[PDB]
Amino acid sequence: QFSEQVNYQRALEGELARTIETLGPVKSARVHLAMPSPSASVTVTLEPGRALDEGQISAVVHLVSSAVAGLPPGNVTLVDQSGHLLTQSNTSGRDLNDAQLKFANDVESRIQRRIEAILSPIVGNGNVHAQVTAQLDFANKEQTEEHYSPNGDASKATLRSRQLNISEQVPRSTQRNETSNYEVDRTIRHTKMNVGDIERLSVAVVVNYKLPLTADQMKQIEDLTREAMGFSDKRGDTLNVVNSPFS
Amino acid sequence: EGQISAVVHLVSSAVAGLPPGNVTLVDQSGHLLTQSNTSGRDLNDAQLKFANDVESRIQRRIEAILSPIVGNGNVHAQVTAQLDFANKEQTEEHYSPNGDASKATLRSRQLNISEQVPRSTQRNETSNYEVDRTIRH
Amino acid sequence: QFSEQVNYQRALEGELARTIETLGPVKSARVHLAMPSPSASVTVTLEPGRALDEGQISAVVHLVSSAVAGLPPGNVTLVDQSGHLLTQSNTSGRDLNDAQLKFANDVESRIQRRIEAILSPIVGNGNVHAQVTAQLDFANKEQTEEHYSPNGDASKATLRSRQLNISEQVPRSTQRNETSNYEVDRTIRHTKMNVGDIERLSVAVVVNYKLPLTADQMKQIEDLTREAMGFSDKRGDTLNVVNSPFS
Amino acid sequence: RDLNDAQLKFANDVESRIQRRIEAILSPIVGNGNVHAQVTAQLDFANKEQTEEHYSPNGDASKATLRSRQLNISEQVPRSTQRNETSNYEVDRTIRHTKMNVGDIERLSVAVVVNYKLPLTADQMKQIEDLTREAMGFSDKRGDTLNVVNSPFS
Amino acid sequence: QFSEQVNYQRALEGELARTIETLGPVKSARVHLAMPSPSASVTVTLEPGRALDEGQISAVVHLVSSAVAGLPPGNVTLVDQSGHLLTQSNTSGRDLNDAQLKFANDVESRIQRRIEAILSPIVGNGNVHAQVTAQLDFANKEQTEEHYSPNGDASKATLRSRQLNISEQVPRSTQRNETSNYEVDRTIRHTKMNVGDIERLSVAVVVNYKLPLTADQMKQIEDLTREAMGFSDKRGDTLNVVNSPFS
């Protein structure tokens, strides 16, 4: 019975490694599974003069993470024929904050590829350079408001019961007991903020000379960038565009 | 979509040690054709792929509504969409004010009254209302 | 008994991969299942000089997600013969929000076709362009009104019981107790609003010259689109029609 | 420590990206190799949670929300008065719950050296200080510091 | 039954050692497992004239840590054909304690290279030297604040209930009872400080002559290093730059 679930695992490993071989850059793979939480360890041997890209690693990770029951992609270990541990699950100190940087690069590559594309028509193909700096927050935040419309003013309150005794005598010994049980409006917002929104932008743009561009023409080049940025001083953004000759 | 990998692998392979994830293809109209998706922050790049579409559409639209007027090459427009991805709920629970007796809705009432004569009066009164109640969610 | 549910899974994998082969761009597939939450990992090898489109991926995803019991399409992993993990589901984040753009495009494509089809006869086949932008609404809103009816008036109350004690001792030491137990009219609406209704429209229409167009001639062209839109000041829809020569 | 020298790799990626960005934005002006910048980042690798629980002041009755209210008001007239008054309230309550990010920049220090052309003009050097002030993300509330000097290379 | 889980372990060891052989610098490996917390002990025999780098060790560690069920990478032991225990999850005495010197040397290795990199342009390639001393901090520390906003002010208090009796009699026998229950906003931070931050830097910098250097030409070199350090008087840092001819 034990050699049943072992003669099978030895076949899975030999089948999983037959596909990773039929994958292009890989010349021969060699995978071992650790099914007891599980793990795997691929040992691809890339073709002569080749190297798996950053997105070609997840190809071989998910190719094994998914073909094995209950194996997350954080347990798969990929290694070349020259050492070079390619995965980062084994180096799970953080292994997520390279993503926090690669991501915040993509957010800034866009706002740069855009500013370079809204001014290339005006000032020519390569007479403008822009570098963006974005401060992205990654605080996993939540919230829960709970409002309550004020029923202070009687004419906008919503009574549910009301016991009102009004005694009186005449030595005018009056009396007035008055209970109440209001009902209350009640909003309940429950946000859950996004992990990675932009918190502040910083854009610096240089533009070649023509000879110096017009003072007005820079004020209009500024205004385009203020839009291609999504400039919002509420976020405390900041833009600086200077005009000076190039190399 | 498959003509991009033609030009990516045409360069990724002709250069020693260059994976296809590092090649960047760009047209004569901006339009970065390749991609730099990651595997760790796999959710948040979608928040960019998506937000790129939202802006790709408003851009085509403006390029398509004005190119008739000013010509098919004399206009460019870039859009920046500050999107929102905060999973958010709400539950209003409105009521209607029933202080004005003409529009209250009693369910019970116990209006004890009295008097003597030294006008030693009295007036007890209970009341139980029913209440309009909207519940948006 | 174990080699029963394993000799079978090995046949499913070999059958599932025989269909993905008979699929056009695919030259040879290779699928492994991970039935215990299950998973799969297709490894298609596209024909020389081919690439699966964005909607040709869901073809191969649902082709496997459905042929396996309890396997959602968020667990299927598709990989080419050149790495290139094609599946954008491992994220499972925004496979829905892409559909909110296809939909919002169709809604706007229809109002565009209609505005072209109504004005094409008047001003000519190609002498008009229109573009529509619709702020749709995808909030899964629900509601439960519950109205009552004001029985504060005796001439429209509905007593169910009534106990009215009226003493009097003429020093007119009168007295008057009274109870009541009304029945109440009680409406209960319960909406569950629709996901994708239009919140606001915005249409821009250009019309070629002939020579300009007459004031009234435009004033009525404006009124046509105002009906082809579905224009409603309640939603605050915006229409803007201009007349300018084409090129 | 294996988990703890992954903070020097991470802090060196943050610095090397700010450094590429400063050279990439000054290389057009001063020249391809007439500028060198070095950035020092103090990062925060402390885990940190938080949980506010704000309430809204209901001391003013024109903005309170009563749930109940038993107000007795006896009075005789020698003016023996009286005025009991219970009041149950409903209170507006926000509840944030942050879990701060591990690895945010706390403070930056950037040092830039630009070659000579022959010194650069005092105006041409302010517009280099200002460009660098945007490639850093210069925030004065973080206590960022920038130093650009002009001196001939070797 | 026992020779079942032993004839298997002897095969795992022989399979795991067949991959580490197909790994480049390794000529022949020899691994034993200790599955009962498990452990392993690889005994690679590198090729003639080779040595595994610092990141080539984790390649062979994770190659085994992952191929064995429940084996952390802190239990794998790698040894060459010349003694030389390569892993560091085996020293009992100073494994962590010596690491605080390896680590605190890197924090100083960088700031050293940095001050050379920034100053070598100005003063010349090899006309400067810098040595850095970093008083690090490895005290595992936690914290838990719990603040409360002061509600002594009625205008910014927040009653949850309040019972306010009053009286009088006129012999002005007055009276005033008053209960109160408040709600109190309550922040709760919970830090967990980083083990390995910097307490204080001390940097010494020597620069060659040219023929000494002037005041500003020295002062600005002081200002650069003050930035290339991360100088902040809050940490009580110390910088000393001197100009003296080399030899």
mmCIF file with all atom_site columns, N, CA and C in Angstrom, chain A residues 53 56 99 103 106 113-114 157-162 164-166 168 183 185-190 192 194-195 227-228 235, chain B residues 19-21 32 36 41 44 47 55 80 82 87-91 93-98 121 123-125 127 129 131:
data_model
loop_
_atom_site.group_PDB
_atom_site.id
_atom_site.type_symbol
_atom_site.label_atom_id
_atom_site.label_alt_id
_atom_site.label_comp_id
_atom_site.label_asym_id
_atom_site.label_entity_id
_atom_site.label_seq_id
_atom_site.pdbx_PDB_ins_code
_atom_site.Cartn_x
_atom_site.Cartn_y
_atom_site.Cartn_z
_atom_site.occupancy
_atom_site.B_iso_or_equiv
_atom_site.pdbx_formal_charge
_atom_site.auth_seq_id
_atom_site.auth_comp_id
_atom_site.auth_asym_id
_atom_site.auth_atom_id
_atom_site.pdbx_PDB_model_num
ATOM 1   N N  . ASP A 1 53  ? 13.961  33.832 -18.380 1.00 0.00 ? 53  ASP A N  1
ATOM 2   C CA . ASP A 1 53  ? 13.657  35.215 -18.041 1.00 0.00 ? 53  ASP A CA 1
ATOM 3   C C  . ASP A 1 53  ? 12.907  35.262 -16.711 1.00 0.00 ? 53  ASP A C  1
ATOM 4   N N  . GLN A 1 56  ? 9.624   33.625 -17.344 1.00 0.00 ? 56  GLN A N  1
ATOM 5   C CA . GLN A 1 56  ? 9.826   32.240 -17.735 1.00 0.00 ? 56  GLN A CA 1
ATOM 6   C C  . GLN A 1 56  ? 10.092  31.340 -16.540 1.00 0.00 ? 56  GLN A C  1
ATOM 7   N N  . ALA A 1 99  ? 8.783   42.520 -5.491  1.00 0.00 ? 99  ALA A N  1
ATOM 8   C CA . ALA A 1 99  ? 7.570   42.848 -6.228  1.00 0.00 ? 99  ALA A CA 1
ATOM 9   C C  . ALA A 1 99  ? 7.138   44.278 -5.952  1.00 0.00 ? 99  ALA A C  1
ATOM 10  N N  . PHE A 1 103 ? 6.737   46.514 -9.132  1.00 0.00 ? 103 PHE A N  1
ATOM 11  C CA . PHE A 1 103 ? 5.439   47.126 -9.369  1.00 0.00 ? 103 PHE A CA 1
ATOM 12  C C  . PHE A 1 103 ? 5.561   48.638 -9.450  1.00 0.00 ? 103 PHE A C  1
ATOM 13  N N  . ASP A 1 106 ? 6.632   49.798 -12.631 1.00 0.00 ? 106 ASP A N  1
ATOM 14  C CA . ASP A 1 106 ? 5.646   49.790 -13.702 1.00 0.00 ? 106 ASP A CA 1
ATOM 15  C C  . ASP A 1 106 ? 4.721   50.991 -13.609 1.00 0.00 ? 106 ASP A C  1
ATOM 16  N N  . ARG A 1 113 ? 6.284   56.818 -20.029 1.00 0.00 ? 113 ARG A N  1
ATOM 17  C CA . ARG A 1 113 ? 5.995   56.518 -21.426 1.00 0.00 ? 113 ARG A CA 1
ATOM 18  C C  . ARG A 1 113 ? 4.862   57.375 -21.953 1.00 0.00 ? 113 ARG A C  1
ATOM 19  N N  . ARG A 1 114 ? 4.036   57.907 -21.060 1.00 0.00 ? 114 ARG A N  1
ATOM 20  C CA . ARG A 1 114 ? 2.931   58.752 -21.479 1.00 0.00 ? 114 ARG A CA 1
ATOM 21  C C  . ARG A 1 114 ? 3.398   60.178 -21.718 1.00 0.00 ? 114 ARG A C  1
ATOM 22  N N  . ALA A 1 157 ? -37.347 63.558 14.169  1.00 0.00 ? 157 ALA A N  1
ATOM 23  C CA . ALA A 1 157 ? -37.103 62.323 14.888  1.00 0.00 ? 157 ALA A CA 1
ATOM 24  C C  . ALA A 1 157 ? -38.128 61.273 14.492  1.00 0.00 ? 157 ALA A C  1
ATOM 25  N N  . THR A 1 158 ? -37.836 60.025 14.835  1.00 0.00 ? 158 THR A N  1
ATOM 26  C CA . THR A 1 158 ? -38.686 58.897 14.478  1.00 0.00 ? 158 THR A CA 1
ATOM 27  C C  . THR A 1 158 ? -38.993 58.137 15.755  1.00 0.00 ? 158 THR A C  1
ATOM 28  N N  . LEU A 1 159 ? -40.020 58.581 16.464  1.00 0.00 ? 159 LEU A N  1
ATOM 29  C CA . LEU A 1 159 ? -40.427 57.907 17.682  1.00 0.00 ? 159 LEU A CA 1
ATOM 30  C C  . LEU A 1 159 ? -40.890 56.493 17.382  1.00 0.00 ? 159 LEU A C  1
ATOM 31  N N  . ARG A 1 160 ? -40.665 55.603 18.334  1.00 0.00 ? 160 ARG A N  1
ATOM 32  C CA . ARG A 1 160 ? -41.221 54.266 18.271  1.00 0.00 ? 160 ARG A CA 1
ATOM 33  C C  . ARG A 1 160 ? -42.241 54.018 19.361  1.00 0.00 ? 160 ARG A C  1
ATOM 34  N N  . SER A 1 161 ? -42.029 54.591 20.538  1.00 0.00 ? 161 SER A N  1
ATOM 35  C CA . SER A 1 161 ? -43.036 54.636 21.579  1.00 0.00 ? 161 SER A CA 1
ATOM 36  C C  . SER A 1 161 ? -42.848 55.938 22.330  1.00 0.00 ? 161 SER A C  1
ATOM 37  N N  . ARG A 1 162 ? -43.874 56.344 23.061  1.00 0.00 ? 162 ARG A N  1
ATOM 38  C CA . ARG A 1 162 ? -43.813 57.628 23.744  1.00 0.00 ? 162 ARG A CA 1
ATOM 39  C C  . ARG A 1 162 ? -44.858 57.652 24.836  1.00 0.00 ? 162 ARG A C  1
ATOM 40  N N  . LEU A 1 164 ? -46.267 59.845 27.819  1.00 0.00 ? 164 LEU A N  1
ATOM 41  C CA . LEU A 1 164 ? -46.228 61.249 28.208  1.00 0.00 ? 164 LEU A CA 1
ATOM 42  C C  . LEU A 1 164 ? -47.331 61.508 29.223  1.00 0.00 ? 164 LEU A C  1
ATOM 43  N N  . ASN A 1 165 ? -46.970 61.557 30.497  1.00 0.00 ? 165 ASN A N  1
ATOM 44  C CA . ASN A 1 165 ? -47.902 61.939 31.545  1.00 0.00 ? 165 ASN A CA 1
ATOM 45  C C  . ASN A 1 165 ? -47.776 63.428 31.807  1.00 0.00 ? 165 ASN A C  1
ATOM 46  N N  . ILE A 1 166 ? -48.905 64.109 31.944  1.00 0.00 ? 166 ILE A N  1
ATOM 47  C CA . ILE A 1 166 ? -48.929 65.536 32.246  1.00 0.00 ? 166 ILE A CA 1
ATOM 48  C C  . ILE A 1 166 ? -49.935 65.734 33.373  1.00 0.00 ? 166 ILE A C  1
ATOM 49  N N  . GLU A 1 168 ? -51.218 68.032 36.784  1.00 0.00 ? 168 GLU A N  1
ATOM 50  C CA . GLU A 1 168 ? -51.405 69.458 37.009  1.00 0.00 ? 168 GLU A CA 1
ATOM 51  C C  . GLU A 1 168 ? -52.308 69.642 38.213  1.00 0.00 ? 168 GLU A C  1
ATOM 52  N N  . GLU A 1 183 ? -36.168 55.689 16.978  1.00 0.00 ? 183 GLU A N  1
ATOM 53  C CA . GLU A 1 183 ? -35.490 54.865 16.002  1.00 0.00 ? 183 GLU A CA 1
ATOM 54  C C  . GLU A 1 183 ? -34.549 55.773 15.235  1.00 0.00 ? 183 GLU A C  1
ATOM 55  N N  . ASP A 1 185 ? -31.641 56.534 12.076  1.00 0.00 ? 185 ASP A N  1
ATOM 56  C CA . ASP A 1 185 ? -30.971 56.265 10.819  1.00 0.00 ? 185 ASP A CA 1
ATOM 57  C C  . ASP A 1 185 ? -29.556 55.793 11.100  1.00 0.00 ? 185 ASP A C  1
ATOM 58  N N  . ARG A 1 186 ? -29.023 54.954 10.220  1.00 0.00 ? 186 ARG A N  1
ATOM 59  C CA . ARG A 1 186 ? -27.754 54.318 10.540  1.00 0.00 ? 186 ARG A CA 1
ATOM 60  C C  . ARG A 1 186 ? -27.055 53.882 9.257   1.00 0.00 ? 186 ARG A C  1
ATOM 61  N N  . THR A 1 187 ? -26.096 54.676 8.813   1.00 0.00 ? 187 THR A N  1
ATOM 62  C CA . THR A 1 187 ? -25.240 54.289 7.708   1.00 0.00 ? 187 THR A CA 1
ATOM 63  C C  . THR A 1 187 ? -24.080 53.465 8.237   1.00 0.00 ? 187 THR A C  1
ATOM 64  N N  . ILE A 1 188 ? -23.692 52.441 7.490   1.00 0.00 ? 188 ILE A N  1
ATOM 65  C CA . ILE A 1 188 ? -22.536 51.646 7.874   1.00 0.00 ? 188 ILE A CA 1
ATOM 66  C C  . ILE A 1 188 ? -21.643 51.424 6.668   1.00 0.00 ? 188 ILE A C  1
ATOM 67  N N  . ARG A 1 189 ? -20.677 52.303 6.458   1.00 0.00 ? 189 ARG A N  1
ATOM 68  C CA . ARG A 1 189 ? -19.699 52.068 5.415   1.00 0.00 ? 189 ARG A CA 1
ATOM 69  C C  . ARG A 1 189 ? -18.658 51.088 5.914   1.00 0.00 ? 189 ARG A C  1
ATOM 70  N N  . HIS A 1 190 ? -18.108 50.306 5.001   1.00 0.00 ? 190 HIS A N  1
ATOM 71  C CA . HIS A 1 190 ? -17.045 49.389 5.397   1.00 0.00 ? 190 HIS A CA 1
ATOM 72  C C  . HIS A 1 190 ? -16.082 49.282 4.219   1.00 0.00 ? 190 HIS A C  1
ATOM 73  N N  . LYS A 1 192 ? -12.251 48.804 2.368   1.00 0.00 ? 192 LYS A N  1
ATOM 74  C CA . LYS A 1 192 ? -11.061 47.975 2.508   1.00 0.00 ? 192 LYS A CA 1
ATOM 75  C C  . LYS A 1 192 ? -10.104 48.463 1.425   1.00 0.00 ? 192 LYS A C  1
ATOM 76  N N  . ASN A 1 194 ? -7.128  49.833 -1.132  1.00 0.00 ? 194 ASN A N  1
ATOM 77  C CA . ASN A 1 194 ? -6.354  49.111 -2.121  1.00 0.00 ? 194 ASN A CA 1
ATOM 78  C C  . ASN A 1 194 ? -4.880  49.150 -1.754  1.00 0.00 ? 194 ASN A C  1
ATOM 79  N N  . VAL A 1 195 ? -4.208  48.019 -1.940  1.00 0.00 ? 195 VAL A N  1
ATOM 80  C CA . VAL A 1 195 ? -2.799  47.888 -1.600  1.00 0.00 ? 195 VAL A CA 1
ATOM 81  C C  . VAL A 1 195 ? -2.001  48.279 -2.836  1.00 0.00 ? 195 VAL A C  1
ATOM 82  N N  . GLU A 1 227 ? -1.282  67.287 -16.891 1.00 0.00 ? 227 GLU A N  1
ATOM 83  C CA . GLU A 1 227 ? -2.408  66.410 -17.172 1.00 0.00 ? 227 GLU A CA 1
ATOM 84  C C  . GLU A 1 227 ? -1.979  64.972 -17.393 1.00 0.00 ? 227 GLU A C  1
ATOM 85  N N  . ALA A 1 228 ? -0.921  64.749 -18.167 1.00 0.00 ? 228 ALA A N  1
ATOM 86  C CA . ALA A 1 228 ? -0.416  63.395 -18.332 1.00 0.00 ? 228 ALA A CA 1
ATOM 87  C C  . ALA A 1 228 ? 0.081   62.806 -17.022 1.00 0.00 ? 228 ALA A C  1
ATOM 88  N N  . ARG A 1 235 ? -2.862  65.351 -3.307  1.00 0.00 ? 235 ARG A N  1
ATOM 89  C CA . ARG A 1 235 ? -1.871  64.334 -2.993  1.00 0.00 ? 235 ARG A CA 1
ATOM 90  C C  . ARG A 1 235 ? -0.507  64.925 -2.690  1.00 0.00 ? 235 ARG A C  1
ATOM 91  N N  . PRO B 2 19  ? 16.793  37.104 -21.989 1.00 0.00 ? 19  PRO B N  1
ATOM 92  C CA . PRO B 2 19  ? 15.487  36.452 -21.972 1.00 0.00 ? 19  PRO B CA 1
ATOM 93  C C  . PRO B 2 19  ? 14.470  37.277 -22.735 1.00 0.00 ? 19  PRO B C  1
ATOM 94  N N  . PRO B 2 20  ? 13.349  36.681 -23.143 1.00 0.00 ? 20  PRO B N  1
ATOM 95  C CA . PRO B 2 20  ? 12.321  37.462 -23.842 1.00 0.00 ? 20  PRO B CA 1
ATOM 96  C C  . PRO B 2 20  ? 11.537  38.384 -22.927 1.00 0.00 ? 20  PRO B C  1
ATOM 97  N N  . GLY B 2 21  ? 11.730  38.294 -21.615 1.00 0.00 ? 21  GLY B N  1
ATOM 98  C CA . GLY B 2 21  ? 11.098  39.201 -20.685 1.00 0.00 ? 21  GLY B CA 1
ATOM 99  C C  . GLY B 2 21  ? 11.775  40.539 -20.538 1.00 0.00 ? 21  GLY B C  1
ATOM 100 N N  . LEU B 2 32  ? 3.603   50.840 -26.155 1.00 0.00 ? 32  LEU B N  1
ATOM 101 C CA . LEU B 2 32  ? 4.442   49.745 -25.693 1.00 0.00 ? 32  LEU B CA 1
ATOM 102 C C  . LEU B 2 32  ? 3.734   48.419 -25.926 1.00 0.00 ? 32  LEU B C  1
ATOM 103 N N  . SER B 2 36  ? 5.661   43.927 -18.780 1.00 0.00 ? 36  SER B N  1
ATOM 104 C CA . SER B 2 36  ? 6.637   43.660 -17.691 1.00 0.00 ? 36  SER B CA 1
ATOM 105 C C  . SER B 2 36  ? 5.889   43.147 -16.454 1.00 0.00 ? 36  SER B C  1
ATOM 106 N N  . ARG B 2 41  ? 3.736   40.405 -7.125  1.00 0.00 ? 41  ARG B N  1
ATOM 107 C CA . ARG B 2 41  ? 2.635   41.366 -7.077  1.00 0.00 ? 41  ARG B CA 1
ATOM 108 C C  . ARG B 2 41  ? 1.686   41.122 -8.252  1.00 0.00 ? 41  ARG B C  1
ATOM 109 N N  . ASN B 2 44  ? -1.683  43.288 -8.365  1.00 0.00 ? 44  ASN B N  1
ATOM 110 C CA . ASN B 2 44  ? -1.664  44.722 -8.590  1.00 0.00 ? 44  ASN B CA 1
ATOM 111 C C  . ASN B 2 44  ? -1.241  45.095 -10.000 1.00 0.00 ? 44  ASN B C  1
ATOM 112 N N  . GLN B 2 47  ? -4.338  45.540 -11.751 1.00 0.00 ? 47  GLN B N  1
ATOM 113 C CA . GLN B 2 47  ? -4.853  46.880 -11.528 1.00 0.00 ? 47  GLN B CA 1
ATOM 114 C C  . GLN B 2 47  ? -4.210  47.909 -12.440 1.00 0.00 ? 47  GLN B C  1
ATOM 115 N N  . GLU B 2 55  ? -7.993  53.664 -20.018 1.00 0.00 ? 55  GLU B N  1
ATOM 116 C CA . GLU B 2 55  ? -7.385  54.823 -20.648 1.00 0.00 ? 55  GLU B CA 1
ATOM 117 C C  . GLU B 2 55  ? -7.107  54.599 -22.121 1.00 0.00 ? 55  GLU B C  1
ATOM 118 N N  . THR B 2 80  ? -5.215  59.903 -18.186 1.00 0.00 ? 80  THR B N  1
ATOM 119 C CA . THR B 2 80  ? -4.796  59.343 -16.905 1.00 0.00 ? 80  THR B CA 1
ATOM 120 C C  . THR B 2 80  ? -6.039  59.151 -16.054 1.00 0.00 ? 80  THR B C  1
ATOM 121 N N  . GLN B 2 82  ? -7.420  58.056 -12.618 1.00 0.00 ? 82  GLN B N  1
ATOM 122 C CA . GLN B 2 82  ? -7.262  57.705 -11.213 1.00 0.00 ? 82  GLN B CA 1
ATOM 123 C C  . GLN B 2 82  ? -8.410  56.785 -10.844 1.00 0.00 ? 82  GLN B C  1
ATOM 124 N N  . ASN B 2 87  ? -12.553 47.683 -2.185  1.00 0.00 ? 87  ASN B N  1
ATOM 125 C CA . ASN B 2 87  ? -13.752 46.922 -1.872  1.00 0.00 ? 87  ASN B CA 1
ATOM 126 C C  . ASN B 2 87  ? -14.538 47.653 -0.806  1.00 0.00 ? 87  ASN B C  1
ATOM 127 N N  . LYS B 2 88  ? -15.742 48.081 -1.149  1.00 0.00 ? 88  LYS B N  1
ATOM 128 C CA . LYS B 2 88  ? -16.488 48.937 -0.248  1.00 0.00 ? 88  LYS B CA 1
ATOM 129 C C  . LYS B 2 88  ? -17.942 48.517 -0.242  1.00 0.00 ? 88  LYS B C  1
ATOM 130 N N  . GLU B 2 89  ? -18.555 48.578 0.924   1.00 0.00 ? 89  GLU B N  1
ATOM 131 C CA . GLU B 2 89  ? -19.956 48.254 1.088   1.00 0.00 ? 89  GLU B CA 1
ATOM 132 C C  . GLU B 2 89  ? -20.657 49.439 1.728   1.00 0.00 ? 89  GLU B C  1
ATOM 133 N N  . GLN B 2 90  ? -21.910 49.236 2.098   1.00 0.00 ? 90  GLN B N  1
ATOM 134 C CA . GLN B 2 90  ? -22.693 50.270 2.746   1.00 0.00 ? 90  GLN B CA 1
ATOM 135 C C  . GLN B 2 90  ? -24.010 49.653 3.163   1.00 0.00 ? 90  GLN B C  1
ATOM 136 N N  . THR B 2 91  ? -24.627 50.244 4.172   1.00 0.00 ? 91  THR B N  1
ATOM 137 C CA . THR B 2 91  ? -25.967 49.826 4.560   1.00 0.00 ? 91  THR B CA 1
ATOM 138 C C  . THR B 2 91  ? -26.660 51.043 5.163   1.00 0.00 ? 91  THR B C  1
ATOM 139 N N  . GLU B 2 93  ? -29.972 52.855 6.521   1.00 0.00 ? 93  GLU B N  1
ATOM 140 C CA . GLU B 2 93  ? -31.226 52.400 7.099   1.00 0.00 ? 93  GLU B CA 1
ATOM 141 C C  . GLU B 2 93  ? -31.986 53.665 7.471   1.00 0.00 ? 93  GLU B C  1
ATOM 142 N N  . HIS B 2 94  ? -32.753 54.161 6.526   1.00 0.00 ? 94  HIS B N  1
ATOM 143 C CA . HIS B 2 94  ? -33.444 55.416 6.711   1.00 0.00 ? 94  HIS B CA 1
ATOM 144 C C  . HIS B 2 94  ? -34.763 55.161 7.418   1.00 0.00 ? 94  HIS B C  1
ATOM 145 N N  . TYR B 2 95  ? -35.318 56.209 7.999   1.00 0.00 ? 95  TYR B N  1
ATOM 146 C CA . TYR B 2 95  ? -36.610 56.115 8.652   1.00 0.00 ? 95  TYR B CA 1
ATOM 147 C C  . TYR B 2 95  ? -37.449 57.314 8.258   1.00 0.00 ? 95  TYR B C  1
ATOM 148 N N  . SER B 2 96  ? -38.722 57.252 8.588   1.00 0.00 ? 96  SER B N  1
ATOM 149 C CA . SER B 2 96  ? -39.328 58.525 8.247   1.00 0.00 ? 96  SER B CA 1
ATOM 150 C C  . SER B 2 96  ? -39.787 59.229 9.510   1.00 0.00 ? 96  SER B C  1
ATOM 151 N N  . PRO B 2 97  ? -39.562 60.531 9.608   1.00 0.00 ? 97  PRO B N  1
ATOM 152 C CA . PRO B 2 97  ? -39.962 61.249 10.816  1.00 0.00 ? 97  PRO B CA 1
ATOM 153 C C  . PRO B 2 97  ? -41.465 61.204 11.001  1.00 0.00 ? 97  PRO B C  1
ATOM 154 N N  . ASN B 2 98  ? -41.886 60.822 12.199  1.00 0.00 ? 98  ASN B N  1
ATOM 155 C CA . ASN B 2 98  ? -43.302 60.741 12.519  1.00 0.00 ? 98  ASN B CA 1
ATOM 156 C C  . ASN B 2 98  ? -43.653 61.635 13.696  1.00 0.00 ? 98  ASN B C  1
ATOM 157 N N  . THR B 2 121 ? -56.278 68.750 37.010  1.00 0.00 ? 121 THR B N  1
ATOM 158 C CA . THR B 2 121 ? -56.386 67.913 35.823  1.00 0.00 ? 121 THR B CA 1
ATOM 159 C C  . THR B 2 121 ? -55.315 66.827 35.836  1.00 0.00 ? 121 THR B C  1
ATOM 160 N N  . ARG B 2 123 ? -53.347 64.073 32.439  1.00 0.00 ? 123 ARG B N  1
ATOM 161 C CA . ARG B 2 123 ? -53.474 63.502 31.101  1.00 0.00 ? 123 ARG B CA 1
ATOM 162 C C  . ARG B 2 123 ? -52.311 62.542 30.864  1.00 0.00 ? 123 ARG B C  1
ATOM 163 N N  . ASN B 2 124 ? -52.563 61.254 31.027  1.00 0.00 ? 124 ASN B N  1
ATOM 164 C CA . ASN B 2 124 ? -51.580 60.248 30.668  1.00 0.00 ? 124 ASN B CA 1
ATOM 165 C C  . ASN B 2 124 ? -51.818 59.802 29.240  1.00 0.00 ? 124 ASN B C  1
ATOM 166 N N  . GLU B 2 125 ? -50.756 59.366 28.575  1.00 0.00 ? 125 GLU B N  1
ATOM 167 C CA . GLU B 2 125 ? -50.900 58.954 27.185  1.00 0.00 ? 125 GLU B CA 1
ATOM 168 C C  . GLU B 2 125 ? -49.715 58.104 26.781  1.00 0.00 ? 125 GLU B C  1
ATOM 169 N N  . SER B 2 127 ? -48.212 55.532 23.599  1.00 0.00 ? 127 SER B N  1
ATOM 170 C CA . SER B 2 127 ? -48.348 55.470 22.156  1.00 0.00 ? 127 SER B CA 1
ATOM 171 C C  . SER B 2 127 ? -47.315 54.505 21.626  1.00 0.00 ? 127 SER B C  1
ATOM 172 N N  . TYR B 2 129 ? -45.940 53.415 17.821  1.00 0.00 ? 129 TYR B N  1
ATOM 173 C CA . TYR B 2 129 ? -46.040 53.745 16.417  1.00 0.00 ? 129 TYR B CA 1
ATOM 174 C C  . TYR B 2 129 ? -45.486 52.612 15.581  1.00 0.00 ? 129 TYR B C  1
ATOM 175 N N  . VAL B 2 131 ? -43.309 52.459 11.802  1.00 0.00 ? 131 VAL B N  1
ATOM 176 C CA . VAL B 2 131 ? -42.341 53.379 11.227  1.00 0.00 ? 131 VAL B CA 1
ATOM 177 C C  . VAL B 2 131 ? -41.976 52.924 9.825   1.00 0.00 ? 131 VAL B C  1
#
